[PDB]
Each structure stands twice: as C-alpha cells, then as structure tokens.
C-alpha cells in the first residue's frame, strides 16, 4: 500500500514465527523497540498488528517513535511508546518501473499533524491562502498528495523501501499470538528435569496407557500430584513417576 492509505492486517490466533525473519535477515533495517531484535521476539502477544507501506529510503528513520518529519506528521505517525519492530528493505527491482512508478502517494501538506495510528484518505484541496479552494487546483491551493516517482536508475535514498511496521502489545498472560518455540527431543526412562508448559518437575517419563481428553494437558491423581502429562509438540501422553530413592 501507499503511505497515506497505510494498510493494516491483524495477525491473530496463530503461532508467530520471528526466527524466520531473523535468520533470513533480508531486511536492511531491523530496529525493534521494547522487544529487542536480539532473539527476544519469541514471546506471546494478545495482538499483533502488521502494517505495510512503501517509503523512500531517506526518510525511513523518520518513522521511528518520537521522531518528526513530513511522513511522520502527515502520513503515518508512530506512538512515542511504540514497542514493535520497524522493518525496512529495498524494493528497487519490484517497486521501481522504467520511466517512474507513480502508484505510491504521500501527503506533503495537511492542516494538522497526524495522531498515532490514524488514517486520512481525504482528497480535500489543502488551504494555503485567504482565497477558498472550492475544489480547484490553483494558487495557494494544492493537492495534498504527490507521487514519489521512484526511478530504476536513482539513488537508494530516492528508491523505494517497503516497510512492514509490526506493532506488538507485550501482554504474556492473555497471549492470542503464540510465540516461536524451541524444540527438545523426547527422552524416556531417565530421571530428567522436565519443564512442560512452565511446570518444572523431577521424575522419569514412561509410556502411559491413560487416555487424556483433548483439552487436558497434565493429569493429577489422588492427593493432588501430577501423574501423567501430554507433551504439546506431538500430543503424546507420558506417565511421570519419581526416579528411585531411599534410605541407606
């Protein structure tokens, strides 16, 4: 999308994969705020917002929290408390066309500075003089939007940068968006410290004949202690028994 018509998509009710974005590293700009880009995005979120818009290279810093500029105050304003990722990359082959591509617009002037995460699709002729615009293109009345005009042979500062702003809310208790997960291979018939869904315990894991209900993760027998647990990766139910101990 163009910057003025900033398109928003909602990443909801799915396990998120940020490692694939990290290992690819195909994004020249990788600035994450609140959550660090150094493998800290493997976390749980109630709401993940993805927003895409194509800007010129030279003002891709402007769209950072507490920064000011034309794009910042008239097209897309980032909240000063942004706890997300501003990811940017060159799209010169894809988004520059011979003779220029004029499909991407930007609001050079507007009556007032834009509020956080607020859109303006209005085409009302900007006022710059005492004479009313009346919806005509003339002196002291100018169309608010302009074409970037990316050209194939141009500086990267004058070449398009696709930006996919990711807005995280950092709530780990509610957490619709499941985070990326590590993988640890199953080990059986050994006294092992197991951490199943945050539950830490000591004991051996063995094959379990118990049939858990689909909505049940771990089981508790009489006297309220864990007896059988279903691992979430491969939905396998394993019986937990304490490893051997006794007096001497």
């Amino acid at each position, epitope marked *: 999308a163009s910057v003025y018509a900033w398109n928003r998509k909602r990443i909801s009710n799915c396990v998120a994969d940020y490692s694939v974005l990290y290992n690819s590293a195909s994004f020249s700009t990788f600035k994450c705020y609140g959550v660090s880009p150094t493998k800290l995005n493997d976390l749980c979120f109630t709401n993940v917002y993805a927003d895409s818009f194509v800007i010129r290279g030279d003002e891709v810093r402007q769209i950072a929290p507490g920064q000011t500029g034309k794009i910042a105050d008239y097209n897309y304003k980032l909240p000063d408390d942004f706890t997300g990722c501003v990811i940017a990359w060159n799209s010169n082959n894809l988004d520059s066309k011979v*003779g220029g591509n*004029y*499909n991407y617009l930007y609001r*050079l*002037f507007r009556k007032s500075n834009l509020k956080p995460f607020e859109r303006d699709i209005s*085409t009302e002729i*900007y006022q710059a*003089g005492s*004479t*009313p*615009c*009346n*919806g*005509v*293109e*003339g*002196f*002291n*009345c*100018y*169309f*608010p*939007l*302009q*074409s970037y005009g990316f050209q194939p042979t141009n500086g990267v500062g004058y070449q398009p940068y696709r930006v996919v702003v990711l807005s995280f809310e950092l709530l780990h208790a509610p957490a619709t968006v499941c985070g990326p997960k590590k993988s640890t291979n199953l080990v059986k018939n050994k006294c092992v410290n197991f951490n199943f869904n945050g539950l830490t315990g000591t004991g051996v894991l063995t094959e379990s004949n118990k049939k858990f209900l689909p909505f049940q993760q771990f089981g508790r027998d009489i006297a309220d202690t864990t007896d059988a647990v279903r691992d979430p990766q491969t939905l396998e139910i394993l019986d937990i028994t304490p490893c051997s101990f006794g007096g001497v």
Partner: antibody
Amino acid sequence: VQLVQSGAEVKKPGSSVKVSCKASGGTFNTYAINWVRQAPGQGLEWMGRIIPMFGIANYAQKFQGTVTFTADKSTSTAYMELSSLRYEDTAVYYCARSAYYSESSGYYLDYWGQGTLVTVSS
Amino acid sequence: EIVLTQSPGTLSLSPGERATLSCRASQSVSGSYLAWYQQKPGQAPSLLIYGASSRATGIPDRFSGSGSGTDFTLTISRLEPEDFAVYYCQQYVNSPRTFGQGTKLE
C-alpha cells in the same frame, strides 16, 4: 500524448449524450483531464476537471447540475455526460491534460483532443 | 473567479515583426499563474506560454511573455503567415480556470 475523442452527436433536443475522450497510457496516472466548452464563435469556457486516480470531479458554477464527468481507470478513457440538449448547449467539447500535482504545479493544459461537437442534428 | 480582457481584439490583418498581445484582470494574477494558447483554425488550442515567460515543448523560443502582476504580453519576434492563430489567455489562480475572449479572431 494522444487524446483522441468522439466525433459528432446527432442528438435531438432534450436527448442526453456521453463523450469519449481516450487517454493514452500513463495519462490518467499523474494528470487530470479538463473539459472546456467551445460554442461555435466564442471563447473557451472551462467546464471542470476529472482527477481520474481519486475519482474527483469539480465543476464551475455555470455548468453545475447540467453536465456529469466520469472517467474509467481501466481502458484509460475520459467521459462527459450531458443531462439533456438545451438549445444553447451546442458546442465542441474539448479534453485536455493538467499537471494537477503540487510539485509539478502545472494546472495548465498541455495537450488537447480534436473535439466533440454536439448539435440539434449531426 | 477572475475575469480577463484581451486588448488587441483583431490582429489578424497579416502584420509583421513584434506584437503586443495583452491580457488584463480585475484582481492581479498571483504567482504568474497564466497560460497562453494557440487555437489554429479548425483545430484545438495548443499551449503556448505557461507561467509568465516559460517555454513550451515544440514552441519556438520566439514566443515569449514579459508579464508581471496583471500579466499582459505575448512578444513574438516575427508574425509568421501561418502563425496568425487566435491566442487565448487563462488564469488558474484558484478560480474556475476562466479564459479570455481571444486576440487574433478574423
């Protein structure tokens, strides 16, 4: 670069007509289209403009309510609809370019179509 | 809305050398938002001079405008036998792009 328009309309008085100025490739992208009424033997009367990309059409006070401007984003063709043929409405309707963007700040008419003359008959 | 009054109404008497084709407006043209045109007989007008003195693509350098404020000149080095087309003024200063009456009408 080329804005070939419609020819001549055999429209009996009171009968509506639609014009067909044809924009070349990339015309609509960065340029608005303007229509000017040229009644045979007078001066040029600016009717209004069509901003094709955003579908914005604004008309002068004189022609408001009497003429309709439409443009087709696909096929890149400019259209003008006349509500009915009033007796004084007979004129050669032209179509012309404009650098409507602020940075260009043109707003003048670069290139023009051949013209579409409406009349009581031929 | 700003009106325009072309003063030399009829200069199609096959003249020569420099001309003084004029236009004047009730309220002064702002920022040289004027456009000269070239309406050849039987054909559509072609842009002649935009701004105040700027040159158009294809147009000879001979055509020029020495105007300011109430922009009023279309100096031409030499009246060509073919170049007797009625020249039209226009103002785009936040108005409904009104045109003048014409200056070389037979």
